[PDB]
Amino acid sequence: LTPPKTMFIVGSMLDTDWKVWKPMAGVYGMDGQFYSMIYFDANSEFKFGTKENEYIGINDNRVTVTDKAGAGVSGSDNFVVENAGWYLFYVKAAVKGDDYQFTITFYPAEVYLFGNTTGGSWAFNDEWKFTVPATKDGNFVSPAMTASGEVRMCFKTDLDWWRTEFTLHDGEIFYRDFNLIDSWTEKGDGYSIQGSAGNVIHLNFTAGTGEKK
Template sequence: MKKIFKFMLLPALVLPLLFTSCDDDRDSNPTLDLSHVADGFVLNTPALAENNTYDLKSAKSLKLTCSQPNYGGIPYVVRYYVQVSIDPKFVSDPTATHTELATSYKTAEMEVNASEVNDAVVALFQAANPDTSVPDEMPIYIRLRAVIDITADSNLGETYSNVITLPSVKAAYEAPDAKFTDNLYLIGSSIQTPWQSWKAIPKVFGLEGNYYGVIYLPAGGEFKWGTENNDYRGINRLKEINDEAGAGISAGEEQNIKVANAGWYTLLFKGKITEDKKNIEWTLSVYPTKVYILGGSVEMSGTWAFDDAYALTAPADKNGKWVSPAFTASAELRAAVKVGDLDWYRTEFTVYKGNLFWRRYDIVNSWTETEGADYSVTTQVGQKLYIDFDNYTAEVK
């Protein structure tokens, strides 16, 4: 999810600029002349830009004027495209990172959509500085690309203006109301394919904004988390960390979450939407992993509490499988991960087509009744549950 930034906005300035155009070509038989396109054309710098601040979030438009490109004096209709950069290299290097705005203009005096400029500036800044707030003020750099407007896709007569600098600009990101995603995601040095696989972790049933997952970390292992694939969040994106497992958590390379001690860890992320509804504050609690079988498959009367007699045995590392005690009865499989003091039914799972499937609805009687027969596994006396928690695969045999 994107960061939210608040600013005290200055009144928008609409600064008048001088309009310069080329002399009329009075040749009775004009011809298209593209010999001057490499020379470019002039985009005027606002006379008051040096000592004023442009507030892009509050303004409706940003007024720009330019000279017309020299196409031999013929009054062709020219289409202008606005290009924006926050990189000072753009002044002399046209390959520097920049964005061309979607809206184009047909006159050399144009009211550029300030909202488009704002969004472009914010996107450029966040791409270059993913963990930094947009500053209150910054310089931006603008140039124009011009083409003869014959067709929408024509690049005939393509030419560029000089780059102007607006030394003081306010840009702000206005985020939509924050909401929780269906899953969180983990990536790390020992999670599936190291630093390539994004492992989805589910919601805690019935507790909005709570997510849990099981991972193995060797001594010195590191990981990141996110609300979607490729959303690399580190330890600095957590408001609080509770190490209930003695993992020895610290900041690793590039703000990775690092553990000093090897082990199987259960992560519980708790999100709280801020009062302005624009952001989510996250807390991470880390527990030693404990997994249990429950219900009628281990006692004829059924046990519905975490009982160490029915705890799965952990493998040495992520390559092994967790193994349950033998089932003592034929019944529907019921199993859960112990996560802090949460009730077992909030972290219950079943086996569906060889994969762990996490509880998402209120199961009054059975998985069969709530999700369907394919989500229900019937145990037999003497069978065991085997789980690969690195890949979330499982089987009863």
């Protein structure tokens, strides 16, 4: 048994009839770890699984929940999220003997611009944090860039920043899935957003799309 290669979340906040099984992005270089930026309504109810149609709930004795976001997570069968908000839903699925051990973490919605367009910030600095929208269909909005170069964007977790980084590719959010050393152009030029002073990024994480203005 090795760690799972896929992970999905299903629940009321994605579709009121639980028809949407949202695939999670793999954390780069960390087998069995996954992340997804999701809006949870107040009292949302959900489960997750390693494959579509597999339901794992909060009762499962393989599951531990860590709240680092003030989400408020309880329940009998379904996970229940008390406080409405955007959260980074994070799953670590390790192997323990012949079974999985799952650690579910709720991180706060902290998205950052990194790199040359910020004048060289490669640190978590709230000057470069995106503004968070109030609603499920809203946009995260970056501060204005102050210099030219390739955009880098990421979520904040406990790991190195670039384990959970992403870009835009023809207007779609694309999560890093390779050993990116220096530039997105190592995958292709259409992955590299060239920013200039005054440009702004807008991201719609429910639709999976974004733009540079």
